[PDB]
Amino acid sequence: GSIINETADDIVYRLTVIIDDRYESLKNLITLRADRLEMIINDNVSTILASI
Amino acid sequence: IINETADDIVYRLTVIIDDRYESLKNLITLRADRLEMIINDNVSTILASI
Amino acid sequence: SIINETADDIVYRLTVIIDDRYESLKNLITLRADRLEMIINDNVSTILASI
Amino acid sequence: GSIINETADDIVYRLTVIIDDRYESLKNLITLRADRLEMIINDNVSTILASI
């Protein structure tokens, strides 16, 4: 009763922290590598146009 | 009770997982769409400049 | 026992949820990466054939 | 601990291994495809610059 649901709420909270923490890390890596690809791309097109 | 509680756990954590998965799915699609639009735009600029 | 049985059930069910969400994101990442690689290599060969 | 405490610990552990693994594979996948794109982009910019 006070144990079954406190152990239910505890499982959910503990796994929610794991899931949230892994998710935010994936969110940051996608944003990081996409931002990085776009600087690389923007720089290279600037270089090509400035070399023509 | 033991089964009602287990169903509650699986359900609640399944809402979390699906929400996180959905936002990542959207993020991947957004950034990939941006990249495809950026690459096409830039190549069209190069082609009109050579 | 009703405790271990229910625990194995929680793990199995949620593992399928996670695997499904994982394999779907794996496929999306591979797909969008594959397209971007093909768009780049197509567009570069187009430039090179035009210069 | 209690049986419910050791059972809840085993649920969280087994699902944390699953979550982490699927996370780690997506981490390596995103890094891999971003690296592949950058290798392609940089080969192609050096080919364009040497061709104009």
Author numbering:
A (entry chain D), D (entry chain A): 1 to 52
B (entry chain C): 3 to 52
C (entry chain B): 2 to 52
Give excerpts from the publication:
RHCC-NT was first described as an S-layer protein component of the archaea Staphylothermus marinus. Here, we present an unconventional drug delivery device entitled Right-Handed Coiled Coil-Nanotube (RHCC-NT) which is ideally suited to uptake boron clusters into its large internal cavities. In addition to binding small molecules, this nanotube can be internalized by eukaryotic cells, which offers possibilities for targeted drug delivery in BNCT. Although the polydispersity of the sample increased, the cumulant radius remained the same over the temperature gradient. This highly stable tetrameric structure prevents the protein from dissociating or exposing the hydrophobic cavities to the exterior.
Based on spatial analysis, the two center cavities each have a spherical volume of around 240 Å3, allowing for binding of the o-carborane clusters with their steric bulk of 148 Å334. The outer cavities have a spatial volume of around 180 Å3, surrounded by hydrophobic amino acid side chains which would also allow for o-carborane ligand binding. Nonetheless, based on experimental electron densities, we detected that three out of the four nanotube cavities contain boron clusters; o-carborane is absent in the N-terminal cavity of the nanotube. Thus, ligand incubation allows for an integration of 30 boron atoms per nanotube. Interestingly, the uptake of o-carborane did not cause any final conformational changes to the nanotube which is most likely due to the extreme rigidity of the macromolecule caused by its many intramolecular interactions such as salt bridges and additional hydrophobic interactions between the helices. The nanotube has a length of approximately 7.7 nm and a diameter of 1.8 nm, binding three o-carborane molecules.
